[PDB]
Design an enzyme around this catalytic site. Structure first.
Site, mmCIF file in Angstrom:
data_model
loop_
_atom_site.group_PDB
_atom_site.id
_atom_site.type_symbol
_atom_site.label_atom_id
_atom_site.label_comp_id
_atom_site.label_asym_id
_atom_site.label_seq_id
_atom_site.Cartn_x
_atom_site.Cartn_y
_atom_site.Cartn_z
ATOM 1 N N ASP A 62 13.730 6.311 -1.634
ATOM 2 C CA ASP A 62 12.878 6.187 -2.819
ATOM 3 C C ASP A 62 11.511 6.797 -2.552
ATOM 4 O OD1 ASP A 62 14.829 4.384 -4.315
ATOM 5 O OD2 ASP A 62 13.005 4.132 -5.527
ATOM 6 N N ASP A 68 3.508 -0.117 -3.667
ATOM 7 C CA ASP A 68 4.495 -0.476 -2.649
ATOM 8 C C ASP A 68 3.814 -0.757 -1.305
ATOM 9 O OD1 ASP A 68 6.973 1.875 -3.879
ATOM 10 O OD2 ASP A 68 6.937 -0.273 -4.202
ATOM 11 N N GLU A 91 12.162 -3.698 2.348
ATOM 12 C CA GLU A 91 12.678 -2.449 1.792
ATOM 13 C C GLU A 91 11.889 -1.250 2.286
ATOM 14 O OE1 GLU A 91 11.840 -1.512 -2.602
ATOM 15 O OE2 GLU A 91 14.014 -1.734 -2.357
ATOM 16 N N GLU A 92 10.597 -1.442 2.542
ATOM 17 C CA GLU A 92 9.716 -0.336 2.887
ATOM 18 C C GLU A 92 9.685 -0.026 4.372
ATOM 19 O OE1 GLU A 92 8.527 1.419 0.437
ATOM 20 O OE2 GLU A 92 9.403 -0.026 -0.957
ATOM 21 N N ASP A 112 11.708 -7.520 -0.885
ATOM 22 C CA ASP A 112 11.329 -6.292 -1.588
ATOM 23 C C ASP A 112 9.912 -6.518 -2.105
ATOM 24 O OD1 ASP A 112 12.996 -4.846 -4.588
ATOM 25 O OD2 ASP A 112 11.193 -4.168 -3.557
ATOM 26 N N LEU A 114 7.728 -4.971 -3.842
ATOM 27 C CA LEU A 114 7.535 -4.621 -5.246
ATOM 28 C C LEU A 114 8.828 -4.084 -5.855
ATOM 29 C CD1 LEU A 114 5.264 -4.946 -7.192
ATOM 30 C CD2 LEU A 114 4.680 -2.535 -6.887
ATOM 31 N N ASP A 115 9.423 -4.838 -6.772
ATOM 32 C CA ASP A 115 10.670 -4.405 -7.390
ATOM 33 C C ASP A 115 10.384 -3.881 -8.797
ATOM 34 O OD1 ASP A 115 13.735 -4.487 -8.007
ATOM 35 O OD2 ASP A 115 12.929 -5.822 -9.496
ATOM 36 N N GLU A 274 17.626 -7.670 -2.426
ATOM 37 C CA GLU A 274 17.732 -7.660 -3.883
ATOM 38 C C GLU A 274 18.934 -8.486 -4.306
ATOM 39 O OE1 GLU A 274 15.746 -3.416 -5.241
ATOM 40 O OE2 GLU A 274 17.737 -3.243 -4.404
#
Ligand SMILES: O=P(O)(O)OC[C@H]1O[C@](O)(CO)[C@@H](O)[C@@H]1O
Ligand SMILES: [Mg+2]
Ligand SMILES: [Mg+2]
Ligand SMILES: [Mg+2]
Length: 329
Positions: A62, A68, A91-92, A112, A114-115, A274
């Site tokens: 992404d 983020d 996630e990052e 996560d 920031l979703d 998620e």
């Protein structure tokens, strides 16, 4: 207001008889602080010049937004300082983060920060998702401690930065919603012991992928639009932010879908931070969460950034879709 029923108190009161170390309270208090900081930044993002990209790409390829980076730093720093954690998965970050010996606690957290990245710049609802496990090994903490099935979760939930900011928290005995009071910076209990309706009247999916959908998803959607019994067709809703579509599914009932398709054997959404947290919320609310062939919470992950198909919501709706998958098997 002289008696404020805060997330902190709720979590302390409920687990007073079950004795314990209290790190979970510590953990959740800490996360609440990150969530308020993220909410405040989001609410003023355009004036603070926080829209736009960061200049990087995460492992699931992404494009990294500035929010983020900020959200990820905020969540990592508060969990580290909470003294409740040993292994962090975000996630990052390509690899699991290992907390320094001095600050280690017993929990493993997957999140996560920031979703709903595609909705940031158009001011649509976005959120923060998390799942918490107890470390089980007795050896040094590592990525492996994050590779547990969702059924091993001890708590999970999300923050929704929507028309209001809501923290939804699920634990072994149920789901509770706390709303942020922006004047005192406290999460207040507003919905106790939330349960999803057995059947709803909304379906949620990105039909832009119709050319790639399997026959079961295809058949199901056709049935929501043309019910064979002359019932009213279902209405459609797809905000585009998993936290917002799932929150609506929880409080209004219905179904949310991000299935596997011809190009994506395992769907898009990420299992650890998620799919498992939302599946857990949903199961504690009386809902179901499936890939179409197996329960999401029963998958044993082999990759912290593994993807999974997910179909969740009202049990009669999810079951109807499962029957179709079964018929096509
Ligand atoms: O644009 P699509 O493929 O419908 O993906 C939307 C989904 O992607 C996410 O932004 C995660 O990448 C989710 O919040 C949302 O459910
Ligand atoms: Mg997301
Ligand atoms: Mg994200
Ligand atoms: Mg993203």
């Amino acid at each position: 207001d002289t008696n404020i029923v805060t997330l902190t108190r709720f979590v302390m009161e409920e687990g007073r008889k079950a004795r314990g170390t209290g790190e979970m309270t510590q953990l959740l208090n800490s996360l609440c602080t990150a969530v308020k900081a993220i909410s405040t930044a989001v609410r003023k993002a355009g004036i603070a010049h926080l829209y736009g990209i960061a200049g990087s790409t995460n492992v699931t390829g992404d494009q990294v937004k500035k929010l983020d980076v900020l959200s990820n730093d905020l969540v990592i720093n508060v969990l580290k300082s909470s003294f409740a954690t040993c292994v962090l998965v975000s996630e990052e970050d390509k690899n699991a983060i290992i907390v320094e010996p001095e600050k280690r606690g017993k929990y493993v957290v997957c999140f996560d920060p920031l979703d709903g990245s595609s909705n940031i710049d158009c001011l649509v609802s976005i959120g923060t998702i998390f799942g918490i496990y107890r470390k089980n090994s007795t050896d040094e903490p590592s990525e492996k401690d994050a590779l547990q099935p969702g059924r091993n979760l001890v708590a999970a939930g999300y923050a929704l930065y929507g028309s209001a900011t809501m923290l939804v928290l699920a634990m072994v005995n149920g789901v509770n919603c706390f709303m942020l009071d922006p004047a005192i910076g406290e999460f207040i209990l507003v919905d106790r012991d939330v349960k999803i309706k057995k059947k709803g009247s909304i379906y949620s999916i990105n039909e832009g992928y119709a050319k790639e959908f399997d026959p079961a998803i295809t058949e199901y959607i056709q049935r929501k639009k043309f019910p064979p019994d002359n019932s009213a067709p279902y209405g459609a809703r797809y905000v585009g932010s998993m936290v917002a579509d799932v929150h609506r599914t929880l409080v209004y009932g219905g179904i949310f879908m991000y299935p596997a398709n011809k190009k994506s054997p395992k769907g898009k959404l990420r299992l650890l931070y998620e799919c498992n947290p939302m599946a857990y919320v949903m199961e504690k609310a009386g809902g179901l969460a499936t890939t179409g062939k197996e329960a999401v919470l029963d998958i044993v992950p082999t990759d912290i950034h593994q993807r999974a198909p997910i179909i969740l919501g009202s049990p009669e709706d999810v079951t109807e879709l499962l029957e179709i998958y079964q018929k096509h098997a």
